[PDB]
């Protein structure tokens, strides 16, 4: 075994309810943007120092990339509409704190940068200090990832209005099937977004995968934009 995954790794074909042409008016091809896109995510984890703060701790790094590719739009040379680049640096601990049938398994604290690699005016980025907590119980997995925005957020000063201050993740193992829900919700502004997924093994390393996203903040360029996206494709690893 050579490389470690962090988040999920998948490639799906999607259709959004509405494409945010406004935010991307700067690109010449934007006026002819289509609603169907290839969406894919790559997510790797890189252990840098095992045992830094004990036998079950790790200084580590991760990198998650989400891309939206206008594949069918040959008229405009099938450009990428958006890519989000999400590198992290963290301290992780493998734990076994049991409470009410639930076992806390992962405690992770670190720094997160999330940006889209564009110049103005379509530049988007923010920095967060976060903690990720993962607990399981039977066929259930629950992950809470609260954060604190730090630094400059001039590209989208009101990003927390739409993203809130935490991300909740729920997994359910139904046989080899994995039902998943990933979401954010700011109570004070009413804005949020949810990602429901379903995956099933085709083989020991490949899974069929269907995803539905609804709400705000699917990508940085659509952080303040509401859409519903449905997609089908393949997956390497699901959450558990």
């Amino acid at each position: 075994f050579t490389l470690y995954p962090y988040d999920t790794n998948y490639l799906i074909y999607t259709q959004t309810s509405d494409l945010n042409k406004e935010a991307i008016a700067s690109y010449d091809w934007a006026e002819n943007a289509r609603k169907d896109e290839v969406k894919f995510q790559l997510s790797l984890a890189f252990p840098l120092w095992r045992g830094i703060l004990g036998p079950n701790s790790v200084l580590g790094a991760s990198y998650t990339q989400k891309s939206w590719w206008q594949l069918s739009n040959s008229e405009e040379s099938s450009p990428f509409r958006e890519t989000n680049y999400e590198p992290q640096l963290f301290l992780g601990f493998a734990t076994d704190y049991r409470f009410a049938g639930w076992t806390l398994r992962d405690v992770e604290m670190g720094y997160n940068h999330d940006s889209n690699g564009r110049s103005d005016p379509t530049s988007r980025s923010w920095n967060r200090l976060y903690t990720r907590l993962m607990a399981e119980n039977g066929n259930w997995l629950v992950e809470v990832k609260p954060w604190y925005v730090v630094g400059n957020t001039d590209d989208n000063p009101d990003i927390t209005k739409y993203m809130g201050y935490y991300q909740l993740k729920i997994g359910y193992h139904l046989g080899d099937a994995v039902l998943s829900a990933k979401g954010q919700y700011n109570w004070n502004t009413g804005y949020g977004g949810a990602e429901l997924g379903l995956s099933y093994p085709i083989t020991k390393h490949v899974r069929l995968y269907t995803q539905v996203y609804s709400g705000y903040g699917e990508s940085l360029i659509d952080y303040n934009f509401n859409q519903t996206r449905v997609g089908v494709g393949v997956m390497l690893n699901d959450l558990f």
Binding site: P5, Y6, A45, R50, A94, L141
Partner: peptide, 13 residues
């Protein structure tokens, strides 16, 4: 060992 644990996996080799 452990299903879903990113950290436990990273500790492995």
């Amino acid at each position: 060992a452990v299903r879903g644990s990113i950290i436990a996996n990273m500790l492995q080799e």
